[PDB]
Amino acid sequence: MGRLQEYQVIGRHLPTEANPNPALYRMRIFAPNEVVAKSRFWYFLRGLKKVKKATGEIVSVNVISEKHPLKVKNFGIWLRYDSRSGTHNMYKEYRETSRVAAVEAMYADMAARHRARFRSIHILKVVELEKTEDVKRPYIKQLVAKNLSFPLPHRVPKISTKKIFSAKRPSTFS
Amino acid sequence: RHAQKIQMRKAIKQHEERNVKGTAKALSSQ
Amino acid sequence: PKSKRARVYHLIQVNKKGREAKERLFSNIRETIPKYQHCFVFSVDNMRNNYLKDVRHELNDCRIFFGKTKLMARALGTTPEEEQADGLHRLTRYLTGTVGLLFTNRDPADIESYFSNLSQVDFARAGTVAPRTVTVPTGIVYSTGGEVPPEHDVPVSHTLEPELRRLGMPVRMIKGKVCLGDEKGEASEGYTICKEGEVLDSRQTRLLKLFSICLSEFKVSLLGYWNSASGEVTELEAGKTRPKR
RNA sequence: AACGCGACGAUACUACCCGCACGUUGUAGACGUAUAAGAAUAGGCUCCGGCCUCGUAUCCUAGCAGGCGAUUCCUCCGCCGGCCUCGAAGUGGCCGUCGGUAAUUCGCGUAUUGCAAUUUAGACACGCGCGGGAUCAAAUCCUUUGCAGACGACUUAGAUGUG
RNA sequence: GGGAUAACUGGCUUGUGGCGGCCAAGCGUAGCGACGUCGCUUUUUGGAUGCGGCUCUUCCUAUCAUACCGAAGCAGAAUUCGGUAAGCGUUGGAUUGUUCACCCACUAAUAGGGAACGUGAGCUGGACCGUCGUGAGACAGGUUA
RNA sequence: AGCGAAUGAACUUUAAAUAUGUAAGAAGCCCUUGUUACUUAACUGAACGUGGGCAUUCGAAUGUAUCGACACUAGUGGGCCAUUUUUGGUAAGCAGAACUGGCGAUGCGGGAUGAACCGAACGCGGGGUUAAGGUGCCGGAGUGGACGCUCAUCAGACACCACAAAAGGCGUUAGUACAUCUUGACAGCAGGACGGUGGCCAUGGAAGUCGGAAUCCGCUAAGGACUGUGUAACAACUCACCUGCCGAAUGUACUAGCCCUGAAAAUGGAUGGCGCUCAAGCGU
RNA sequence: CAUCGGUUCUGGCGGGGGGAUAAAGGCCCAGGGAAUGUGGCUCCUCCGGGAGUGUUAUAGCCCUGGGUGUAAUACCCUCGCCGGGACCGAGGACCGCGCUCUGCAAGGAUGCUGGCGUAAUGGUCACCAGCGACCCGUCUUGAAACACGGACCAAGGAGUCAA
């Protein structure tokens, strides 16, 4: 949601006399900016291990972007979302040109279809499907159907919204 | 409808089991 | 999603078999192959095939298999790499449709003589052409549709009334008797179930079966056989002209 | 519908119509206040070639707020008549006369409103004038009636008569 | 005698009891647990009640009648249960302090309710002091809204 | 967290969150020896004094719109609501303590409207920018943009407390698990659905199908001592199951959205009103 | 209107820096790979269109490493330079800080010009229009609501004096 780019965040527990050179954990997340990146990094480490913001430091934050954002990819997203009944696994697919666009579409689709929120959605694993055989969903699969061509019936013309009155009745053909 | 569906499900389960397979009144009356 | 039909769960004692049945069919055919000297492939094109029981009882010492054509074909082996014996992959070429296997320790001439002398009158079955025109006489209708003499026939049943009406005979229930027209048989023309040289429908065939009238013939065609000693297949007169695989 | 509408009759003054002089007269607001197919939008239009996202289109659009004269043009307006047309709350076509008119070019005049000051300019309405035509009415009070009536109101009669 | 509280209901209310056992998808990792079924109430021969009543306007449907439908051994007739319907109508007697139930006569039938803490409009049928007592009350004693 | 440290909320190396008491200087600490009527076996301790030490960071940060003492004078002695913590209780209400905030004495913008909600505090004016709330005029600002979902016989437009349940839905979309499929799955159509056997008992009659109990075998491709219709009893049809034709994905239970139901009376009325349906409804 | 000062809104242009010294991409180079399989070959109810073997061929695509390359661009952060608009002009010799110093945009607006010089600006009344807006006081309570007083006007009228 918003404008997102890939962030890798590496962080570690503060060095001590007992445990110098700590474990130096890392993970990749999706945030509008580095502030939210760091905040959710500390959130997930607090949830997983016994590392807090007070006793930890951000070793590195790096913006990772798409290698080839001018080529069309299919992405499989495996995620957890918690509703009033509990936490559920879902695997969906998105035909996009970048992982950030795929996650944009995923958040929009979650909000539209299951009323899930940003803190209610956990993104476990987003993958680029290597082969077309790996597509499991009929919508993207019909988009990857061979020799795909379709018309665009009933296109309402884009008339300037201040053009209140028109003399000719508009057409919906081209 | 709830009662009917429960009865039908019980009948289906009992039939599946049986196809796979090959006192207080007394004291009160006394 | 929703808006779907409700499949009925039958309160039944026998269920679907599937894979275990397929496997035991393979096993039975494969254990039967070495026991017998010849394997005949026969065809029963458009017949009811309930007389196969009498065929088995006559040929007790011969093993007859009547299963799915593809399962039988692969049990015998369709290719000369997975064949159980030699030429059996050339007999799976004759295993095409409504066919069956007959493992025999007998003589091919005796088998062809039996299957050319065996012939049983049977009900028409759909798709057959009518040899004759069957017409139900106008008036009081009997249990044969006016084929046996009326003096030697019994009235048809009032529980067959609705089925006859559904199948399309304009009959009536007059004073406890089924009547086509009136009891006088003077107010209606008869009912021609089937006409000569006209392909019968399932409606007409079911009417003929209800009236117990047989217009077709049950005979087994012998497409070919295979001898294990020579490891060789023989083409017979019938198998000369049949859609092959 | 007592602040919705229509047809018809008769309308003395007043002003009832016309011509044109205007108004130190009103307006919920001229300033090119220009533009008629029907019908579909998973179709349509046509000149029958073709064309349709698109009205950022078409017409009209120059001259002392638009003068005078000429070369040149038969084009666009306008007013009257004649024949006809338009009734959903009523208009337009053709023809005829007469009047104006850059499609091209030119001459004579614009000044001084002084460096901007609504470019007072349209329409409908109403009033006051002139000179041309036309017309000479009703209602109320009053008396009376009882088909009416608390009282107003209503149905009647009252000019010569079937009073 | 002192202290607290001083009204109260206001998406309230209606048709299906409570208790214990068995089963029980689940939640959970013992405890909560519906629909059913069993045991008690409960079975082997057929008066209750201690503010009421009448007229008129309008509305609701939770419909007694009239209209139309679905089902029922619904032969016919007479009906029973249910559905849409408020367009149109909707009592009297006996008895009782009153009402209801039952019971009895007409009638097509002789339904039930609201008018919002004043049940639409109209009509009709006491507490403070004083004295004397206190195993307990009395006062033509006084005062008071 | 661990018990590859010991021991076993009552275990611990360590140690959360959360509020909360006290102390943070010359208004200081000591050390040293003179006196005392106190005290000690004693110039020995305690108190009263002397000398020293730091006056420049004099001994955390940030602020400081000064603080203290004495004397005198006026109006006050009520509480209501809400958050969090906590005690008890009911079928549900609810009752009581602690802190804090709002209101009393407070105007203004917004929530259509208003004690308790949100924003924000107030001299008279001009300009600019915002908040909460909004941008289909009424009404200033979008019939703004992207992706989806929903059609309700009085939808919904922030109420999510109640009715409300393990509820009903052959509405719609997304998803989880399990299962069957070119060894041909689901649906259909054409056919088989047989023999011992009218199995035993019972019945006037009961042959799979008024009833009790067992419920096996053969043939098998498969067929129940039978799932319904039917006969007085048969007969007959049909289902289970099987094969042929067809040809590629299906079908069972759950989960999550939006939608219908999940109960309503009585003057005519209310998302504020119009109206709104690829919204002017719902989510981001 | 011109030149300035203060506040502010809004367009445009020229540079610098940082990421993966952006990621990509174009053109080269070296390798590897597959299909939603390009040419070829096989079959195919032949305007036509499918199935199969078949890795660049008469299309191409994906992946890894290298060169142009310190490429461009997006995003973010930055140093400046031009244009358009609105509101305002407090003060009244010099002093001061300064600069781009014959002067200046530097401790607050001057210069030029036009019309009118009178109801023209301005003001007071009455009405219309858009927006806003409970009837005062007393009393009670935490607050409302209730309750109480109020037909109007003139004059009088209530913390004084002494110890």
Automatic annotation (TrEMBL), chain A:
InterPro entries: Ribosomal_eL20 (IPR028877), Ribosomal_eL20_dom (IPR023573), Ribosomal_eL20_eukaryotes (IPR021138). Residues 4-126 form the Large ribosomal subunit protein eL20 domain. One of its GO terms (biological process) is translation. One of its GO terms (cellular component) is ribosome. The keyword Cell division does not apply. One of its GO terms (molecular function) is structural constituent of ribosome. SUPFAM superfamilies: RplX-like. Pfam families: Ribosomal_L18A. Keywords: Ribonucleoprotein, Ribosomal protein. Signal peptide: none annotated. Belongs to the eukaryotic ribosomal protein eL20 family. This is 60S ribosomal protein L20. It comes from Chaetomium thermophilum (strain DSM 1495 / CBS 144.50 / IMI 039719).
UniProtKB/TrEMBL annotation, chain B:
It is found in: Nucleus, Nucleolus. Coiled coil: none annotated. Involved in the biogenesis of the 60S ribosomal subunit. May play a part in the quality control of pre-60S particles. Belongs to the eukaryotic ribosomal protein eS8 family. Ribosome biogenesis protein NSA2 subfamily. Component of the pre-66S ribosomal particle. This is Ribosome biogenesis protein NSA2 homolog. It comes from Chaetomium thermophilum (strain DSM 1495 / CBS 144.50 / IMI 039719) (Thermochaetoides thermophila). The lineage of its organism: Eukaryota, Fungi, Dikarya, Ascomycota, Pezizomycotina.
